[PDB]
Symmetry: C3
């Protein structure tokens, strides 16, 4: 159902699409944009059947220092997201996804 | 300004976009994803100027068994969408859409 | 994580993506779709660090009479959106965006 959690997931997903569009036209992403993009990589990766361990590593390869504004890699200590896997929902933590 | 319901409709439209994105990615759709895609087909066909009769038909040719997870086509007895027509808002029902 | 207002702004941004999709398939936009597109132009221009005056001018050149249904240009007296620039939030109004 469209629980507040489901709405929130779809919002984060569209926010990631929008942040990707911004980056693709040359902008460096700000902190919430970078979070959306990394979170969306996790969400979609889980939907593909990637494992938590795979996502913990690949979520660190999505954005680099060049992709985000000054200060963003330092402010983004980790991204934590509940993703849906084949074997249920799991919290995925990507540590230090940019630096 | 968007009403909380308008926001609901747009969220479900985006969910269908994400579903079509996943299907494009080679993923067989689950139950809610399939619903979102068929729902969206109806809403977009109504916007195009299609009749309720046309949409009940075309709605059954959006996704086949190959496009969805095993079990989904039997879970999806119907998809109902309130769609706006020049004639008014009507509930459009697509029966056994995966078939 | 998102306020009502943030949710609404993200959904209005999505509405423009949907309006672009409708246009791409050969639809002329209606009044609310046109509002979304012009609003998106402003919001994205603001994010880009364009100036209010730049956007008030370029907002008049996003959609032409061909892009919208007959009688829509006359319906669109103005499109007003709050947008956050590098120097903060401003109400931006695009006047007579089509004709």
């Amino acid at each position: 159902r469209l629980t507040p959690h489901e709405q929130e997931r779809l919002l984060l997903s569209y926010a990631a699409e929008l942040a990707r569009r911004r980056r693709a036209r040359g902008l460096r992403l700000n902190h919430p944009e970078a979070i959306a993009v990394i979170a969306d990589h996790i969400l979609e990766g889980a939907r593909d059947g990637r494992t938590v361990a795979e996502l913990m590593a690949s979520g660190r390869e999505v954005l680099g220092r060049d992709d985000v504004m000054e200060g963003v890699p330092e402010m983004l200590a980790e991204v934590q997201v509940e993703a849906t896997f084949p074997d249920g929902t799991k919290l995925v933590t990507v540590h230090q996804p940019i630096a």
